[PDB]
């Protein structure tokens, strides 16, 4: 129940005020029950070399990558370690982390408010849910509404919770009921909250 780790490579060559920056990425992708590995080596914002496991060996992204792709691709003992990752570290950590991640389901909270002053909007604010995937829908006297509907992008709170806002432009006639409905995996059943337009 310890997380798994790869070491980045140590290139040969170690053989506004000034600032230099080196970045690395070791990314695991998980498409329907599978595992793809990318190892990336970046100098100030510039990816210059990368190991993609689909590809199977090093690919210089930039001419700064040549001294690396050429050296390392004659070095098979290293090239195999990168080849084994998708089914060691990637798969280890994926299923290890699962029950608090993939299985992590935190329920949305829902609030509905006007916005007539300052058109005529209604605001469905949905807060404090995980994961990002969600669906927010608007209903007028039972009928779904596509028109006049603006949903924000999905907002990331930075603390493992998202929020989203979906507004609807409207013009209440008389006995009108507007309903906002939310579909999210954390919920056995979609949640609704209403505005009576008496």
């Amino acid at each position: 129940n310890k997380f798994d780790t790869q070491l980045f490579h140590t290139i040969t060559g170690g053989s506004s005020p000034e600032n230099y920056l080196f970045q690395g990425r070791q990314e695991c992708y998980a498409f329907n029950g599978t595992q793809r590995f990318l190892e990336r080596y970046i100098y100030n914002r510039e990816e210059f070399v990368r190991f993609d496991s689909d590809v199977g060996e090093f690919r210089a992204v930039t001419e700064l990558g040549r001294p690396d792709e050429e050296y390392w691709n004659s070095q098979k003992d290293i090239l195999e370690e990168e080849r084994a990752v998708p089914d060691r570290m990637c798969r280890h950590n994926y299923e290890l982390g699962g029950p608090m991640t993939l299985q992590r389901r935190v329920q949305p909270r829902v609030n509905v408010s006007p916005s007539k002053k300052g058109h005529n909007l209604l605001v469905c604010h949905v807060t404090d849910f995980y994961p990002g995937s969600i669906q927010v829908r608007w209903f007028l006297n039972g009928q779904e509404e596509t028109a006049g509907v603006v949903s924000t992008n999905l907002i990331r709170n930075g603390d493992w919770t998202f929020q989203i806002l979906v507004m609807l432009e409207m013009t209440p006639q008389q006995g009108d009921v507007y309903t906002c409905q939310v579909e999210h995996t954390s919920l056995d059943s979609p949640v609704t909250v209403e505005w009576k337009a008496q």
């Binding site: 129940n1 310890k2 997380f3 780790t5 790869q6 070491l7 980045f8 490579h9 140590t10 290139i11 060559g13 170690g14 506004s16 000034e18 600032n19 230099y20 920056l21 080196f22 970045q23 690395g24 990425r25 070791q26 990314e27 695991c28 992708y29 998980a30 498409f31 329907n32 793809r36 970046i42 100098y43 100030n44 914002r45 510039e46 990816e47 210059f48 700064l64 001294p67 990637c90 950590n93 994926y94 290890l96 982390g97 029950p99 608090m100 991640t101 993939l102 909270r109 609030n111 408010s113 807060t127 404090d128 994961p131 907002i155 990331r156 709170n157 930075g158 603390d159 493992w160 929020q163």
Partner: protein
């Protein structure tokens, strides 16, 4: 790339300011990091800490390794410094604002490079010294960065706030207004 989920170790190393970061994220959310002074792993949510662990050295090692790579690319790059990419900033609350009722203001600082950055909150124009927290420097797909600062507060009509930001890509320090709309 077309995946269901993305789990990535992201680390950086630079001459300035915050000299190194080692972290890991799940679908963009930092799950843990290695504190390079305390030499310990910090878990983002404590409930994480009670189930999983990570051997901290694995982080200090990768840092040392990235400095070698830094040196090696200062040399071969001919000493190329990157242009200063300026932050874009938004400020929004954590919950639907309710007067007199405890809440959290978020300031999202986005799309910048490099991760050398000063941030402070101001309440009615005065520096705020407590009720304040901050995210690590977070990695981005296009190799720029983002970050979050937080302020716990009691929403009120009589009060305004600004996220105040400082970065080499800005001429002037940048302020974002927010107030109980």
């Amino acid at each position: 790339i077309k995946a269901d989920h993305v789990s990535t170790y992201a680390a950086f190393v630079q001459t300035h300011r915050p000299t190194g970061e080692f972290m890991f994220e799940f679908d963009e959310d930092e799950m843990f990091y290695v504190d390079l002074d305390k030499k310990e792993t910090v878990w983002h949510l404590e409930e994480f800490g009670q189930a999983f662990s990570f051997e901290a050295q694995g982080g200090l090692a990768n840092i040392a390794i990235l400095n070698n790579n830094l040196n090696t690319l200062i040399q071969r790059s001919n000493h190329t410094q990157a242009t200063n990419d300026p932050p874009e900033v938004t400020v929004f609350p954590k919950e639907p604002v309710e007067l007199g009722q405890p809440n959290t203001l978020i300031c999202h600082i986005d799309k910048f490079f490099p991760p050398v950055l000063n941030v402070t909150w101001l309440c009615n124009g005065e520096l705020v010294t407590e009720g304040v927290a901050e995210s690590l420097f977070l990695p981005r797909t296009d190799y720029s960065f983002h970050k979050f600062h937080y302020l716990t507060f009691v929403p009120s009509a009589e009060d305004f706030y600004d996220c105040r930001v400082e970065h080499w890509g800005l001429d002037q320090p940048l302020l974002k207004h927010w107030e109980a709309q």
